[PDB]
Amino acid sequence: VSPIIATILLIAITVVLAATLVTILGGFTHGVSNTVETAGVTSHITSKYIFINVSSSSSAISASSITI
Amino acid sequence: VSPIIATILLIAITVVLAATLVTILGGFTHGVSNTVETAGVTSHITSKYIFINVSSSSSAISASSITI
Ligand SMILES: *[C@@H]1O[C@H](CO)[C@H](O)[C@H](O[C@@H]2O[C@H](CO)[C@@H](O[C@@H]3O[C@H](CS(=O)(=O)O)[C@H](O)[C@H](O[C@H]4O[C@H](CO[C@H]5O[C@H](CO)[C@@H](O)[C@H](O)[C@@H]5O)[C@@H](O)[C@H](O[C@H]5O[C@H](CO)[C@@H](O)[C@H](O)[C@@H]5O)[C@@H]4O)[C@H]3O[C@@H]3O[C@H]([C@H](O)CO)[C@H](O)[C@H](O)[C@H]3O)[C@H](O)[C@H]2O)[C@H]1O
Ligand SMILES: *[C@@H]1O[C@H](CO)[C@H](O)[C@H](O[C@@H]2O[C@H](CO)[C@@H](O[C@@H]3O[C@H](CS(=O)(=O)O)[C@H](O)[C@H](O[C@H]4O[C@H](CO[C@H]5O[C@H](CO)[C@@H](O)[C@H](O)[C@@H]5O)[C@@H](O)[C@H](O[C@H]5O[C@H](CO)[C@@H](O)[C@H](O)[C@@H]5O)[C@@H]4O)[C@H]3O[C@@H]3O[C@H]([C@H](O)CO)[C@H](O)[C@H](O)[C@H]3O)[C@H](O)[C@H]2O)[C@H]1O
Ligand SMILES: *[C@@H]1O[C@H](CO)[C@H](O)[C@H](O[C@@H]2O[C@H](CO)[C@@H](O[C@@H]3O[C@H](CS(=O)(=O)O)[C@H](O)[C@H](O[C@H]4O[C@H](CO[C@H]5O[C@H](CO)[C@@H](O)[C@H](O)[C@@H]5O)[C@@H](O)[C@H](O[C@H]5O[C@H](CO)[C@@H](O)[C@H](O)[C@@H]5O)[C@@H]4O)[C@H]3O[C@@H]3O[C@H]([C@H](O)CO)[C@H](O)[C@H](O)[C@H]3O)[C@H](O)[C@H]2O)[C@H]1O
Numbered sequence A, B: 001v002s003p004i005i006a007t008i009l010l011i012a013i014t015v016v017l018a019a020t021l022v023t024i025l026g027g028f029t030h031g032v033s034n035t036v037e038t039a040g041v042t043s044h045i046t047s048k049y050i051f052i053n054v055s056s057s058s059s060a061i062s063a064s065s066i067t068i
Helices: A002-025 B002-025
Strands: A039-045 A050-057 B039-045 B050-057
Touching: A002 B002
Parallel strands: none
Antiparallel strands: A039 A050, B039 B050
């Protein structure tokens, strides 16, 4: 009798460890993305205005997505 | 007499536990397979057509097996 019952208990424990491990991995598998951008930019500054002129960029992006 | 009869009953019980355990294991030993695929794909979109051009793939697969 007892060696089979001990085996059933060890299967029950194994499932909870595997379920625990899955929640540990979730802290690694997020928030990685390609954020690199590169632009040819020239600028001139005066007592009233900053002028900014763009010559090229790595990608086309919205002017609302850029913070100054 | 009675210690031998008690032993015969415990053998009968043991077989039913082993048969029970075998049906528990069957829930683990299925549905695991190598499903990973990886392709070099490029695409262009227009008001009438999507164009899709493939440069390489990890394996050769039927175009009917892919869902869009
Ligand atoms: C990005 O890409 C763009 C597009 O290609 C440009 O190439 C940019 O390069 C910059 O461009 C700006 C704008 O052209 C340049 O700013 C000028 O800088 C010159 C100096 S410079 O040595 O001549 O080269 C001038 O300062 C010029 O100003 C003009 O306007 C002045 C103000 O006149 C305004 O207001 C009056 C009312 O008071 C209006 O009647 C008039 O219509 C106008 O709206 C004038 O005083 C000035 O006269 C004298 O200026 C200088 C001395 O400061 C002198 O050296 C000159 O010979 C001249 O005698 C001149 O007529 C600048 O132009 C901008 O004008 C705006 C104005 O709102 C009109 O848009 C601002 O008010 C400023 O005056 C000024 O920013 C800059 O130098 C370039 O780098 C690329 O970076
Ligand atoms: C999962 O997988 C999916 C599918 O692949 C996506 O990839 C998803 O990624 C997310 O997608 C959503 C939806 O595309 C993104 O939410 C958008 O976020 C952008 C910000 S961003 O910087 O431009 O990238 C915008 O906020 C955008 O909102 C649009 O709609 C706004 C509201 O317009 C709605 O209502 C008006 C009436 O008032 C209608 O006329 C119109 O048709 C529409 O229904 C606009 O204001 C907005 O304009 C400006 O928005 C931002 C500032 O907020 C600015 O930066 C922009 O440049 C632009 O000038 C823009 O047009 C979001 O889209 C969703 O739109 C719904 C709307 O119901 C339509 O479905 C909501 O109302 C919200 O507006 C918004 O959720 C999200 O960023 C992605 O992560 C993957 O995760
Ligand atoms: C156990 O171990 C064995 C041995 O190793 C296997 O590995 C087994 O795995 C299963 O194997 C079976 C048999 O190979 C697989 O069933 C096939 O499934 C595919 C789908 S798949 O995405 O391509 O992978 C197909 O459905 C295939 O069917 C073929 O046959 C169809 C019917 O053709 C029959 O009838 C015509 C007359 O109408 C005859 O001319 C012809 O000779 C043949 O007898 C075709 O329609 C089918 O074409 C298209 O099928 C699919 C769409 O359904 C599409 O995706 C394909 O790209 C293709 O364009 C294809 O040619 C299945 O094979 C079995 O064929 C028998 C037939 O009797 C011949 O034996 C049946 O009639 C069924 O058609 C089908 O069961 C199964 O997927 C595997 O899991 C291990 O489990």
